[PDB]
Amino acid sequence: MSVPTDGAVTTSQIPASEQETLVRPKPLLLKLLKSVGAQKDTYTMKEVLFYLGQYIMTKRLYDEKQQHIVYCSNDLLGDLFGVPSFSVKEHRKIYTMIYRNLVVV
Numbered sequence: 001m002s003v004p005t006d007g008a009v010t011t012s013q014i015p016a017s018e019q020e021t022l023v024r025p026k027p028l029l030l031k032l033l034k035s036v037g038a039q040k041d042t043y044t045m046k047e048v049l050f051y052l053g054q055y056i057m058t059k060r061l062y063d064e065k066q067q068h069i070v071y072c073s074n075d076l077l078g079d080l081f082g083v084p085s086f087s088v089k090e091h092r093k094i095y096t097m098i099y100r101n102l103v104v105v
């Protein structure tokens with residue numbers, strides 16, 4: 001990972017320009033972002049990933065760091081993504097699940 005600002009996280013697995021994609025989260029995704037301090041309705045993807053990461057850690061969905069698995073089956077995030085769990089290493093898979101929950105500007 002890289003952290004180009006205090007509210008963004010990027011990855012070499014995804015093109016840099018893709019992480020600058022402007023998006024308008026649908027209501028559930030937006031709710032999760034605002035629960036950890038987000039104050040707007042439009043974001044770059046790298047900001048969405050930052051806030052989703054904060055949400056995951058705040059809800060204690062990634063306690064076992066070395067296992068690299070988020071367990072979200074009983075959380076809003078599991079409903080958002082439509083999976084019971086996923087790997088924090090699989091960044092394209094994560095981007096794909098997020099894209100289903102937003103409109104691209």
Ligand SMILES: COc1cc(NC(=O)C[C@@]2(C)C[C@H](c3cccc(Cl)c3)[C@@H](c3ccc(Cl)c(F)c3)N([C@H](CS(=O)(=O)C(C)(C)C)C3CC3)C2=O)ccc1C(=O)O
Nearest residue numbers: 001009010011049050052053056057062088089091094095
């Ligand atoms: C790809 O290979 C690896 C990946 C990893 N780990 C990751 O890629 C996970 C990552 C470091 C980036 C990992 C990340 C970062 C940028 C983009 C993407 Cl798609 C993923 C990122 C993350 C953020 C949001 C979501 Cl929804 C998610 F599932 C995972 N998170 C966040 C923490 S954070 O990076 O935001 C930090 C607080 C440390 C700045 C954790 C809470 C979910 C990570 O911890 C570890 C080891 C290896 C290896 O084999 O060497």
